[PDB]
A = this chain, B = another copy of it.
Amino acid sequence: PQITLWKRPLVTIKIGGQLKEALLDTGADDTVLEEMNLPGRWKPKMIGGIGGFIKVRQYDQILIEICGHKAIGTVLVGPTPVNIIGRNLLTQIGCTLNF
């Protein structure tokens, strides 16, 4: 699907058997999700954005179905105000910017 940007590009994702809505973010290099419970072992990490830095838990090789498109990659879980789909997963489902 082609997505115009007159509204926030929110899509429905399926991660760990849970349904959530996430923001297709071309300005994000990696995926960051709000607090949730994810299987497996994680490693602590600190990511930076506007306003400073937050502590997140890095989960590797996590499957996500983004708007019916499957992808596996690293997912960061932490106090993000909004669920974000970063470029690490956008490239797997073949997303492009066109103008």
Instruction: Tell me the number of copies of this protein.
Output: 2
Instruction: Report whether B48 and A5 are in contact in the complex, using a CB–CB cutoff of 8 Å.
Output: no
Q: Which has the most chain B C-beta neighbours within 10 Å: A6, A82, A95?
A: A95
Instruction: Give the residue of B4, B50, B94 whose beta carbon is less than 8 angstroms from that of A54.
Output: B50
Further contacts, 20 of them, CB under 8 A, given A5-B87, A51-B53:
A5-B26, A5-B90, A8-B87, A23-B26, A24-B27, A25-B27, A26-B27, A26-B97, A27-B27, A47-B50, A48-B51, A49-B50, A50-B50, A50-B54, A50-B80, A52-B52, A93-B99, A95-B98, A96-B97, A97-B97
Binding site for B on A (CB under 8 A): 1-6, 8-9, 23-29, 32, 47-54, 67, 69, 80-82, 84, 87, 90-91, 93-99
